[PDB]
A = this chain, B = another copy of it.
Amino acid sequence: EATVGQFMIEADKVAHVQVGNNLEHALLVLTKTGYTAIPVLDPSYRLHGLIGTNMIMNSIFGLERIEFEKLDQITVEEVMLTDIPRLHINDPIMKGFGMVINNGFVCVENDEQVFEGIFTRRVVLKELNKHIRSL
């Protein structure tokens, strides 16, 4: 009966990078924030996709070595996943629940794809636990 919007972590408290940033910066943010995947936005705060640490590692993984020194030569745009799950700041939580089964978190956007925040597994789990506690 509830909606994704209220259970999400607002965009202000969510780390993100831009489509134009290079992989080295993207990797620095992921590592320092502890995120394994982060929202990728454009200068207009519109949601374009997700990029993760493993994705970055594979993009520079050679047949014999990890080419860290080429990270700042590749942009987030070239590596990011663009076909990502998306929730509306007004969708039902059952919609969210279904989507976090396979995703640590799901990005939430406004009507024009403006990034609003993320809907996480943790919030769904916390709420679910309270419900079972209810029985």
A-B contacts, 16 listed (Cβ < 8 Å): A24-B66, A27-B57, A27-B66, A30-B57, A31-B54, A36-B53, A36-B54, A53-B53, A66-B71, A68-B68, A94-B132, A101-B122, A102-B122, A104-B121, A121-B122, A124-B125
Bound-state CA distance A6–B84 (Å) is 31
A98 CB, min distance to chain B CBs, angstroms: 7
Contact at A129–B57, with CB atoms within 8 Å?
A: no
- How far is A127 from B71 in the complex, measured between Cα atoms in Å? 40
Output the nearest chain B residue to A124 by Cβ-Cβ distance: B125
CB within 8 Å for A129 and B104 given contacts A53-B57, A54-B53: no
Chain A, 31-85, CB within 8 A of any chain B CB: 31-32, 34, 36, 53-54, 57-58, 61, 66, 68-69, 71
Closest to A104 in B: B104
Query: Across the interface, which residues of B come within 8 angstroms of A69, CB to CB?
Result: 66, 68
Query: How far is the CB of A65 from the nearest CB of chain B, in Å?
Result: 8
User: Of B54, B94, B121, which one neighbours A121 at CB under 8 angstroms?
Assistant: B121
Contact A132 B97 (CB under 8 A): yes
List the B side residues contacting A132 at CB < 8 Å: 94, 97
A121's closest neighbor in chain B, by CB? B121
